[PDB]
Every structure is written in C-alpha cells, then in structure tokens.
Design a binder for this molecule. Structure first.
Ligand SMILES: *[C@@H]1O[C@H](CO)[C@@H](O[C@@H]2O[C@H](CO)[C@@H](O)[C@H](O)[C@H]2NC(C)=O)[C@H](O)[C@H]1NC(C)=O
Ligand code: NAG
Ligand code: NAG
Ligand code: NAG
Ligand code: NAG
Ligand code: NAG
Lengths: 175, 118, 49, 47, 49
C-alpha cells in the first residue's frame, strides 16, 4: 500500500466489532490483541554471537510491519477493495458487506434483512478464533518450526568445530 | 495464459488497477508484460442509503448503488458516476422498510401514468 | 539411508573413524526424514481435501 | 551543502479517509495506465 | 493481494467456504490471515424442474 490509512476515532461499522484486530493505543506497543498473542506465543536467540556468526537486524522493525498491517486493515474497513486498485473510496461497511454478498452470488437484500445477525456472528467468530489461539499451542507451528530448524542448523554448524578430524585437539593454536 | 489470453479477476496480478488486457514482448532470456489497467481518477462526496422505501416495500439496486447530489436521489454504477432516475427496472422490491436501518423514504416514478396519458 | 551403514559396513574401525567427523550422519538422516514427512504431507493435502 | 543523512524511513504518507455510515465516493473520471512487468524465463545456460 | 485487497473467486484459496474478506496480522517472521467465509448452514428437500 502506497499510503497509510487509519480508522476514524469513532467506531460505527453497523454493529461490526474490530477491536480484536485493530491496534490498542493503551499499551505502549501499537499492535492488536491477536498480534500481541502471536508475539507472546513465540519463545537460542540471544546466544548467536560467539565465533563469527552475526544476526543482521531486520530492515523493517516489528513496529513498521504492525503499521503496515494497521493501514491495510483501515483501508479494507473504510473503503474495501477500491484502495488496492487506485484511489481509496470510502463506503459504509454494511454496503461493503452487501457488495461482497453480491460477489459470492447471494442477493443484496438478505444482508440488510438481518444485518444484526451477521454482525453478531462475525463478532462471535472473532472471539472464537481468539479463544482458540489462546488455548491452542499448535496454531503457530509453522513459524516455530522454521525458527527451530534455523536454530538447530546454527547449533550443528557451531558444534561441527569440536570435531578434531584426527588432530590432537580442535584448537588451532594448541595443535 | 491469464492476463494476455483472457481477463484476470485477480487483484494486482496483471498490474495495479482493474486489468483490461496485456501485451507480451520478448527480451534476452526474459519476457515483458505491458499490463493495461483501468484506474478511477476523480472522486466526489455522495450521500448513499442501503435501500429506498416507496410504498412500504424496500427497494434495492439491481446493479449499482444509491447516491444523492444533496437533494435528489439517483442510482449509479459502482466504478463510474452515471446517475439514473430511480425506476422499477433499476431497483428490485423486497420485504418492508421497517426492518432495515438507514432506509430513507423516497418517490419512485412509474412509466404507467405517462404511458396511459396518451 | 543409514549413514553409518552405507559409509561403514559392520566395521568397528570405520565407525570409530566416522564418529570423529561429527554429526554429518545425523544431519543426513534428519534431512531424509524431513523429505519423507514432506512427501506424506503433500499426498495428504493434495488428496485429503 | 548536500550530504549523506540517515533517518527513520516513513512508510508512506498518512491518510485519513472521511468515513461515515452514509457517505460514499463514486469516481467520475478514469485513466488507462500501462505498467511494465519484467519476468526472467530462461538463464545463461551452459555445459 | 487477492483475499485482502479484493474478493477472491478461487475455491479453498482464502479459507474454505465462500470467501468474503480477510484481515492480515503480523507475527514473528510470518503473517496470519483471518479469512471470513460465508457457509450454508441449514438445508431442505425441494422438488425442482
Ligand atoms: C441534483 O440533480 C438533479 C437532476 O439533474 C437536479 O434537478 C434538476 O437539475 C437541473 C439542472 O440543469 C435543473 O435545471 C432543474 O430545475 C432541477 N430540477 C429540480 C426539480 O430541482 C438538482 O437540481 C440537483 N441538485 C443539486 C444540489 O445539485
Ligand atoms: C489537512 C490538515 O492537515 N488538516 C489538519 C486539521 O485536521 C487539524 O484539525 C489541524 C490542527 O491544527 O491541522 C490541520
Ligand atoms: C437528538 C437526536 O435525535 N439525536 C440522535 C442521537 O441520540 C443518536 O445517537 C444518533 C444516531 O446516529 O442520531 C441522532
Ligand atoms: C467490541 O468488543 C470489545 C470487547 O471485546 C468492547 O469493548 C467493544 O465495545 C465492542 N465494540 C463495540 C462497538 O461495542
Ligand atoms: C468527502 O468529504 C470529505 C469532507 O467533507 C473530504 O475530506 C473528502 O475528500 C470527500 N471525499 C473525497 C473522495 O474526496
Ligand atoms: C432430502 O430427502 C432425503 C430423503 O427424503 C433425506 O434423506 C435428506 O436428508 C433430505 N435433505 C436434507 C437436506 O435433509
């Protein structure tokens, strides 16, 4: 996204609740509750500086990535798909959901007939995914597995030096 | 296969914007695509309502959205401003307007009176 | 592939010599096991839909 | 006297979309943009 | 590009069911997508011609 979008101070999306996905100003870190849970869930990190190994810093700090995600969320909420294909155009979230329903072949009117039901279902689903992430430890298996694989590869590379390969000792100076 | 031989609905696949067509060109050990994209340019404020109530029955746009130039109400395309007079052809009827929130009372012209005027 | 067996055929001396090299055999076995698990996951995801 | 300056990068320009429950933005004019996309196909194959 | 910035018509791409929209979220060296999907719930017999 070329620009940065932010939701209006007042959150009136026709009963839709996005507090669980939007950043929390109260906490010092401007990240959403789900993002905070994901960060806390992930736990051979600070010991990677002994024998020439260095960990170059990430170009995009977690704050910048969080800002990008927040901008994408604000654009999607306030405009929909328009901001992703040119100038961002505002539209009520109810009308955006109606457009989506038309896109998936469902008639528009149905959404306006029970908008409260859809809003409640969306909020319940958000709460359910939050609870599942909180109470489930295998949800983030991919990232943890990748980190563990990198850490064990580094550890094996470091430990390979211990091998003497027939020498009296692995220390170059001593031999 | 997608952008050139057809129109791709994927977003940001055949370039940024609403893809219309693509043109391939060769290059040393590579290809170049000149993606043509429609992109909205000029925007404008408008007041819109989810539906219109005429005679106790909710009215929803068959294809478009309701907008208002301050006083009058029209139905216009989503990606272009082409206001049209509200008529039974433009919008379809459903239920009653007492259920939806945000519906605004309005009048819908009927061709039957001018047709019978003769 | 059993790295110890392929490199050393029921030979105590060859195994003792390989033990000095390091954890090459363990790394190769882990890579092969990961490949097998990846094949199983590919089959499951492509078919068990 | 221009020189080298280090700074914290700005991730674009902040935008505040005028969103409300009964406000929309319907475009009135359009443009046709031609964008280039370069994609390698083969490489400097050798034997 | 597809699920977030638009409505994907592909099947089982942005989550199973009729995709509507997705909300990206950051994570350590990764991303998380919350795909919203419309799914039919209650069915009934009908005689059709
Ligand atoms: C909103 O658009 C309608 C439709 O064009 C306008 O209604 C007519 O506008 C023409 C403009 O040439 C006038 O000559 C007519 O007298 C208008 N008819 C009526 C009954 O007012 C309307 O004026 C527009 N309103 C605004 C605020 O732009
Ligand atoms: C276009 C723009 O920058 N507008 C702002 C305005 O919203 C704000 O109230 C004011 C405060 O000084 O500063 C200016
Ligand atoms: C005087 C009056 O009618 N005020 C109401 C206000 O109470 C309500 O919260 C708002 C809803 O948007 O509409 C207006
Ligand atoms: C959304 O839920 C939070 C608690 O999870 C609540 O504080 C907030 O008020 C809800 N949204 C609205 C619009 O009430
Ligand atoms: C809609 O109106 C607001 C303020 O009235 C303005 O800031 C905004 O730019 C308008 N919409 C567009 C697309 O410009
Ligand atoms: C349709 O009818 C059959 C037999 O009458 C029944 O088994 C089936 O459950 C019906 N459909 C649904 C969705 O229940």
């Amino acid at each position: 996204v070329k620009q940065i979008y932010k939701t209006p101070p007042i959150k009136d999306f026709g009963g839709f609740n996005f507090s669980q996905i939007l950043p929390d100003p109260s906490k010092p870190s401007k990240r959403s509750f789900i993002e905070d849970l994901l960060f806390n869930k992930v736990t051979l990190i600070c010991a990677q500086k002994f024998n020439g190994l260095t960990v170059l810093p990430p170009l995009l700090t977690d704050e910048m990535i969080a800002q990008y995600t927040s901008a994408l969320l604000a654009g999607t909420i306030t405009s929909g798909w328009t901001f992703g294909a040119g100038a961002a155009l505002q539209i009520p979230f109810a009308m955006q959901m109606a457009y989506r329903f038309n896109g998936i072949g469902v008639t528009q009117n149905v959404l306006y007939e029970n908008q409260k039901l859809i809003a409640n279902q969306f909020n319940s689903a958000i709460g359910k995914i939050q609870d599942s992430l909180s109470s489930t430890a295998s949800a983030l298996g991919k990232l943890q597995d990748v980190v563990n694989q990198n850490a064990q590869a580094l550890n094996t590379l470091v430990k390979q030096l211990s091998s003497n390969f027939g020498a009296i000792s692995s220390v170059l100076n001593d031999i | 296969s997608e952008c050139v031989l057809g129109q791709s609905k994927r977003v940001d696949f055949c370039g940024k914007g609403y893809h219309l067509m693509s043109f391939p060109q060769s290059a040393p050990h590579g290809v170049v695509f000149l993606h043509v994209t429609y992109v909205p340019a000029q925007e404008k404020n408008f007041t819109t309502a989810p539906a219109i109530c005429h005679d106790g029955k909710a009215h929803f746009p068959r294809e478009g959205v309701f907008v208002s130039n301050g006083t009058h109400w029209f139905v216009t395309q989503r990606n272009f401003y082409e206001p049209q007079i509200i008529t039974t052809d433009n919008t379809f009827v459903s239920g009653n307007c007492d259920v939806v929130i945000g519906i605004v009372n309005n009048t819908v012209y009927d061709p039957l009176q001018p047709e019978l005027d003769s | 592939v059993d790295c110890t067996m392929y490199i050393c055929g029921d030979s105590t001396e060859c195994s003792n010599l390989l033990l000095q090299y390091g954890s090459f055999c363990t790394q190769l076995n882990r890579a092969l096991t990961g490949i097998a698990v990846e094949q199983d996951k590919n089959t499951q995801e492509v078919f068990a839909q | 006297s221009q020189s080298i300056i280090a700074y914290t990068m700005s991730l674009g320009a902040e935008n505040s979309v005028a969103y409300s429950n009964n406000s929309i933005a319907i475009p009135t004019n359009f443009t046709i943009s031609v964008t280039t996309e370069i994609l390698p196909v083969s490489m400097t194959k050798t034997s």
